[PDB]
Design a protein around this motif. Sequence first.
Motif, PDB file in Angstrom:
ATOM      1  N   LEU A 152       0.842  -1.193   0.000  1.00  0.00           N
ATOM      2  CA  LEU A 152       0.000   0.000   0.000  1.00  0.00           C
ATOM      3  C   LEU A 152       0.880   1.247   0.000  1.00  0.00           C
ATOM      4  N   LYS A 153       1.623   1.401  -1.092  1.00  0.00           N
ATOM      5  CA  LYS A 153       2.393   2.613  -1.308  1.00  0.00           C
ATOM      6  C   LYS A 153       1.449   3.764  -1.594  1.00  0.00           C
ATOM      7  N   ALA A 154       1.798   4.937  -1.093  1.00  0.00           N
ATOM      8  CA  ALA A 154       0.916   6.075  -1.224  1.00  0.00           C
ATOM      9  C   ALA A 154       1.740   7.334  -1.387  1.00  0.00           C
ATOM     10  N   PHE A 155       1.127   8.328  -2.002  1.00  0.00           N
ATOM     11  CA  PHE A 155       1.748   9.626  -2.154  1.00  0.00           C
ATOM     12  C   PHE A 155       0.846  10.674  -1.533  1.00  0.00           C
ATOM     13  N   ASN A 156       1.451  11.743  -1.051  1.00  0.00           N
ATOM     14  CA  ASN A 156       0.689  12.825  -0.460  1.00  0.00           C
ATOM     15  C   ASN A 156       0.485  13.928  -1.475  1.00  0.00           C
ATOM     16  N   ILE A 157      -0.763  14.302  -1.676  1.00  0.00           N
ATOM     17  CA  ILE A 157      -1.073  15.536  -2.371  1.00  0.00           C
ATOM     18  C   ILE A 157      -1.149  16.621  -1.317  1.00  0.00           C
ATOM     19  N   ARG A 158      -0.305  17.636  -1.446  1.00  0.00           N
ATOM     20  CA  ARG A 158      -0.347  18.712  -0.476  1.00  0.00           C
ATOM     21  C   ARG A 158      -1.708  19.376  -0.527  1.00  0.00           C
ATOM     22  N   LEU A 159      -2.352  19.462   0.621  1.00  0.00           N
ATOM     23  CA  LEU A 159      -3.695  20.005   0.708  1.00  0.00           C
ATOM     24  C   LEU A 159      -3.624  21.372   1.367  1.00  0.00           C
ATOM     25  N   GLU A 160      -3.954  22.412   0.601  1.00  0.00           N
ATOM     26  CA  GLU A 160      -3.905  23.763   1.146  1.00  0.00           C
ATOM     27  C   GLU A 160      -4.926  23.931   2.256  1.00  0.00           C
ATOM     28  N   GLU A 161      -6.003  23.159   2.196  1.00  0.00           N
ATOM     29  CA  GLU A 161      -7.007  23.094   3.249  1.00  0.00           C
ATOM     30  C   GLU A 161      -6.477  22.170   4.340  1.00  0.00           C
ATOM     31  N   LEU A 162      -5.904  22.752   5.393  1.00  0.00           N
ATOM     32  CA  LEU A 162      -5.171  21.948   6.368  1.00  0.00           C
ATOM     33  C   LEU A 162      -6.104  21.077   7.196  1.00  0.00           C
ATOM     34  N   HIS A 163      -7.155  21.671   7.748  1.00  0.00           N
ATOM     35  CA  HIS A 163      -8.037  20.968   8.669  1.00  0.00           C
ATOM     36  C   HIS A 163      -9.225  20.385   7.914  1.00  0.00           C
ATOM     37  N   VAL A 164      -9.244  19.066   7.769  1.00  0.00           N
ATOM     38  CA  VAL A 164     -10.301  18.370   7.049  1.00  0.00           C
ATOM     39  C   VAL A 164     -11.189  17.649   8.053  1.00  0.00           C
ATOM     40  N   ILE A 165     -12.480  17.973   8.027  1.00  0.00           N
ATOM     41  CA  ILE A 165     -13.445  17.459   8.998  1.00  0.00           C
ATOM     42  C   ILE A 165     -14.058  16.150   8.527  1.00  0.00           C
ATOM     43  N   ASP A 166     -14.455  16.081   7.257  1.00  0.00           N
ATOM     44  CA  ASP A 166     -15.008  14.853   6.697  1.00  0.00           C
ATOM     45  C   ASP A 166     -14.830  14.858   5.182  1.00  0.00           C
ATOM     46  N   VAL A 167     -14.822  13.651   4.606  1.00  0.00           N
ATOM     47  CA  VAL A 167     -14.466  13.407   3.211  1.00  0.00           C
ATOM     48  C   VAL A 167     -15.361  12.299   2.659  1.00  0.00           C
ATOM     49  N   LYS A 168     -15.718  12.395   1.372  1.00  0.00           N
ATOM     50  CA  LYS A 168     -16.328  11.294   0.622  1.00  0.00           C
ATOM     51  C   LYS A 168     -15.944  11.415  -0.849  1.00  0.00           C
ATOM     52  N   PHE A 169     -16.126  10.322  -1.592  1.00  0.00           N
ATOM     53  CA  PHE A 169     -16.001  10.323  -3.047  1.00  0.00           C
ATOM     54  C   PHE A 169     -17.390  10.328  -3.684  1.00  0.00           C
ATOM     55  N   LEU A 170     -17.582  11.198  -4.676  1.00  0.00           N
ATOM     56  CA  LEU A 170     -18.878  11.392  -5.316  1.00  0.00           C
ATOM     57  C   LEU A 170     -19.166  10.312  -6.359  1.00  0.00           C
ATOM     58  N   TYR A 171     -20.455  10.027  -6.553  1.00  0.00           N
ATOM     59  CA  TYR A 171     -20.916   9.034  -7.517  1.00  0.00           C
ATOM     60  C   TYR A 171     -21.121   9.646  -8.896  1.00  0.00           C
ATOM     61  N   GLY A 172     -20.977   8.809  -9.923  1.00  0.00           N
ATOM     62  CA  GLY A 172     -21.320   9.192 -11.279  1.00  0.00           C
ATOM     63  C   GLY A 172     -20.332  10.104 -11.971  1.00  0.00           C
ATOM     64  N   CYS A 173     -19.135  10.273 -11.423  1.00  0.00           N
ATOM     65  CA  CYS A 173     -18.137  11.166 -11.993  1.00  0.00           C
ATOM     66  C   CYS A 173     -17.084  10.356 -12.741  1.00  0.00           C
ATOM     67  N   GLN A 174     -16.854  10.722 -14.010  1.00  0.00           N
ATOM     68  CA  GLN A 174     -15.907   9.992 -14.849  1.00  0.00           C
ATOM     69  C   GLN A 174     -14.512  10.028 -14.252  1.00  0.00           C
TER      70      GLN A 174
END
Lengths: 1140, 390
Positions: A152-174
């Motif tokens: 499970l190798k992974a890379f970090n995308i630097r997120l300018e939004e430092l504090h993330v409260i909750d996350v999901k992936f959206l449906y139906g997006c190519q």
Amino acid sequence: MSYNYVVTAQKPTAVNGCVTGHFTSAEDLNLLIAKNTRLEIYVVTAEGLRPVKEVGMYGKIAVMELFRPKGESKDLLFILTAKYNACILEYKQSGESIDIITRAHGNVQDRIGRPSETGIIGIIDPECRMIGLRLYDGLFKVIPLDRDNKELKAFNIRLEELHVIDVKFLYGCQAPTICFVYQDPQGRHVKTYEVSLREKEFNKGPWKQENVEAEASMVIAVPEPFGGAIIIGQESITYHNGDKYLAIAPPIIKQSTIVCHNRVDPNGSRYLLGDMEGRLFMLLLEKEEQMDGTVTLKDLRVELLGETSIAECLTYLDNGVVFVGSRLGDSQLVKLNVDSNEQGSYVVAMETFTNLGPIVDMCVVDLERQGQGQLVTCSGAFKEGSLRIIRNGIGIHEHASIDLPGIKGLWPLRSDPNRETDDTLVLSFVGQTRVLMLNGEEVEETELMGFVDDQQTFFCGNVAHQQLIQITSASVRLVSQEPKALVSEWKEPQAKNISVASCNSSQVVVAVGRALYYLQIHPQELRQISHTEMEHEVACLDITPLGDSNGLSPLCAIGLWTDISARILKLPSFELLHKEMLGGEIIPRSILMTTFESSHYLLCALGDGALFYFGLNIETGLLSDRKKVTLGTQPTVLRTFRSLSTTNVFACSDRPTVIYSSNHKLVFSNVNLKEVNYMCPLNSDGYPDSLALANNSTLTIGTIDEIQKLHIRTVPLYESPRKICYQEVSQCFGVLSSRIEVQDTSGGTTALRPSASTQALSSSVSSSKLFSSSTAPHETSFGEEVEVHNLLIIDQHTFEVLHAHQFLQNEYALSLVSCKLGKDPNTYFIVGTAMVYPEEAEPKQGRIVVFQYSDGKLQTVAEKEVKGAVYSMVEFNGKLLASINSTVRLYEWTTEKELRTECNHYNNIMALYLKTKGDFILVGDLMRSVLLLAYKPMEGNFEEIARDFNPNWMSAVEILDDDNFLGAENAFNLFVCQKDSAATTDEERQHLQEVGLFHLGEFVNVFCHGSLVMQNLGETSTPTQGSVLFGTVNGMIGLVTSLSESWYNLLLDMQNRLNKVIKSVGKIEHSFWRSFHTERKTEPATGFIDGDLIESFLDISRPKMQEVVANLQYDDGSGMKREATADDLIKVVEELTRIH
Amino acid sequence: PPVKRSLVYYLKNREVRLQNETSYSRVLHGYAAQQLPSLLKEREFHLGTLNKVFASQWLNHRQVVCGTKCNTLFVVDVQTSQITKIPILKDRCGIHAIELNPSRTLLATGGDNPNSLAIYRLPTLDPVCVGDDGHKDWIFSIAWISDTMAVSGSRDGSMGLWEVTDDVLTKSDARHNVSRVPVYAHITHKALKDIPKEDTNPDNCKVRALAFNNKNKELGAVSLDGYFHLWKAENTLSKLLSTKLPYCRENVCLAYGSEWSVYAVGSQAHVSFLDPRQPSYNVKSVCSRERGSGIRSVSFYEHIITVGTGQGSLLFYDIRAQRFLEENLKLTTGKGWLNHDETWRNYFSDIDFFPNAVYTHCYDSSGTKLFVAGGPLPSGLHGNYAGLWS
């Protein structure tokens, strides 16, 4: 160097996460339940939840998700641990065997970076193109779901939004499109990115919405045909889909924070929501069909369905059923209804699942005063808070009790020949017999015709040809079931009185002095087939049938008064087949033939309470595999009974015990009864699958619990218990507890619902004058969710809340101990408290209170007001030692029965925990680990012997022996620090050596001296010394104990070998798991032994045992170390199982 | 609505596992910062005959490196007091400044040549690169602006900017694999820029302290003629402003508090608190009362500033209370050691003890262990002091 062992007596139970999906197959709807280190897999049936597999991980669980990569027939299961070990798991089954295979794994911890300010988050794309993790602030870690990314190798995308409260992936997006709530100086926002695994960066997403509700979390991605996402706050629910926006703010949800949700409908039409209370809602997304034929959202709508367990997580299931995962109470299965009941509720309870967590305190007691030890714990919180009366041994559910003293025997009868169930119970007494008729649940004394009332019954029961049999001193009597008439009677040729008897469905055998007579039971006839004369007077005899035989025993088992032998005789010839010498000086009082696991055994018990048991060969009467267990001290009576259709044996004694077979060996488990002299099985209409139990003064009828080792008599308080102690003098428990009352328009506070303190048989409120010295008049703000604390006095036999004393407003009652003090003979309840207010980091106010419970009254004996929170108190040389914020204080017990200042100790940040032995005091600091004091009677002060200068965030402490000190800390690690008597300088002597370090994985709430397993006095070969039980926030209970050096130098070697032999789920190395771990350092395990791992030695096949055993050095007691065998280690581990 | 801040809530919630997480971080560590100074006891180290420990830092919770006025470099195992010396990096006097990159992968120190910067790998202290030629005078200060880039100040008022690129590291590693003897990588300044010279003494252009604000990517800098110079340090060194310190002498130490957006600055008597963007009146200062001896190092542990003084006392100042912790509570350095050569014989003929000036001090990664080092205050004396406090 130091020598210690730590083991789990009870697994974690509190649910920390749950999901539904299709993990075991596409067609199984699974519920997956994470409990702190334990993964549980359930199948959703129409009848209810069925558990299918459970796994303990070498790792606390922090994220769990189900997802289905394209082409897969069933979901994969993603798990991330708190040490950031990530893995992808697949359920496999082969026949009955089930394994959780790790397809991919790897530690995703970053060497530098602050762990995120709102838990660990992991989510999976609907098309399963990637997994996204939020481990650290400012970094969004992306795992491509490329099949070649097996590490499970992974890379970090630097997120300018430092504090993330909750996350999901959206449906139906190519493009796989992240949608998340984050926080910034402008408040909270929802924003999206098309995540490019090729560019490894955030391309702009399909939309964004700045300034969502400031309390927003709980992102719901909404599937086709709707698309978009729902945002859930404290006060409103909002839907977004490109340009479209819809929002509602139901006043009904504003009363509580929603903390979990679940997808009812595959198309997103309906969603469950669950608040802090366990109020369960339905959120409706109403469809609108547009003029082009497409489907859209018309409006949102929220309905309250009713109430359930406090929800950590929610799960809609099947057939309208729902599961509620509860961390703070019992978890629930509930059915949703289309129409409400008369109360306006759509939710009906269907099943409930037991949860001990959080175990916030416990004490060890002997309510029967036998000396075994039982553990009563503070468990659950809020409306789920409950005492749990935990005990090695099987409980009895009492349905009825009758005051019939002097019972000398118990047997069921079926007087009605048309009934398969028992309708009659027979009691024997010296010089007389009585019979109890069963009419449903009602029990009434009756006269059974054909039976003799003026003589003692030695045996009776149902027999073949629709008949009842009674055996008395004068005769054997055969009685028809109808009309309860005597049909035949047999008498001894010399008119000598029968002293013991046993009978089955086709045979009768009776003991008359030294003579034994065998009769056959024929229709309306007793036939004497044979007789014999034994060498000595018969002390006991039995002819219980074995195997598939039709009530015909080829064997008779007997015991004798003079040679103290057990013997097997062939029937009808009475030929001696086997003679076994039991030894000792005390006669056998009961003998019994039985079957366990389709294997046959002989049991014979002596008048000294010792029990001998043997394998029994039916065809030859020979005995084998002789073993001995001491069950009691008084004469023991052995009887068969049935439970869940299985055959089991009960040993009636001053220490009642159930005997059953597991893995072809007899297991002995105590029974939670004060005393039993006689018992019998009873399968009646009112008392099905029940047992009848008799002691010296009473008859008890009830149903035996499952033949588990640990039982739990739950008592709901409906309020969070906090601390517990026992007062033998008054036969009472003292229990601190706390209900919630919202400071509503009552001006004071209004309870969520009634609880033990409101429900008590009597109550009081603290009448103290100490805390009068200041208030502001305008303090009491509306809506404040106040926690009101109480002391409950609880009867040890009925667990009636005899009394409930409410503490002062905001006064968290923090510590509780029961002990004698000074030269005063009384046992006292002693409470340490604190006043708690929102803003003050440290308590500046508290008190110590001494109570006594006598003549039904709790009375306040004494008070002292203190400069801090009283975090802990212990008895110390009849003086009382109490820790108060940054200081430890010693109170002498005056002859005036009140505490007075002898002396103080300082040199701490915050002395949260205290423990003592002899003149030595162990103190646990909030960050400075442990220190050891000596008391100086000749100076009236404390001398600090030595301290650990290493930092540790203490959660609990205990003294295992005079030199070894045990500690636990908030990073879920244990450590042992030890006084070096070989130190040569004062600077060395002042320093406690770290001699053990160990990552437990559980936060430990409490250490307590004691054991729940009865002590075999006279057997001092035990590898372990002392006994410290401990409880955890997840409902796990463990035990720590010292060892000798050669025990520990054997056992840590054994642990490292097991660490490498046993494969964890997620392929996490045990040494890494157990390696002492903090934000600041990692160190390999020493000084401790992992008792869970050591007991997992019995959860592995012999080939694995052999891998661990080879070349291990074992001190077999001769003083000479030798290569261990698996059987030696098994014996040692069995000994180590029996310490808890 | 008020904030849920009481530690008893946290403790009960923790007993319940009810989100006892980072929301309480500032409460937990802040409480400790106020309590710890009263619980500390001295443990001196036997360093031998070394001159003065001028710089030190925790490599790890148990390991402190010490850089000396006399160009020897070594580790103190604070637990066992065991010494271990480290190579002293040469060009292609003393170790008056030492620094760690925020990833704790690279250590930066003054070199053999006082003019030249030295880099080592954390945690092994393998040598990385040769001493440079950017400064024409001694390197007086250091600060890591990224994990590849560090800025260094100097007694001539110049400021060299350096990048240890991946090529520098891989060249050091390749060379160390080919040759058994360590052979260094080569480096040169990415830029060389002087400070703005103000109305104060033109020979005293010495830049003695540096600190990097990671939030704004700003570099703070302090001179001994009393001026602060501010530089942007995103990708290159760029002047932003310069301003006078309220105490304008002996400003040898500077620290930056990321939890308070403020730099703390030493002087001959006072600790001064600067946000460099603000006007000069928004720069409040506390007097150590150890007057005449100078503040000799400074550091932050939550809202508590630890002040090492020329009188060998360590003071602890509470931002929120705006006073020292308690009759100020202060450790004081033990006698350490002192050499009795001709210099002491001439000028200090009857002094057997010195109030050993705290040239360096630092908190371990927990903050419960405070390493301290120093020596006599006057310039001609040779005599180390070191001791852990815990």
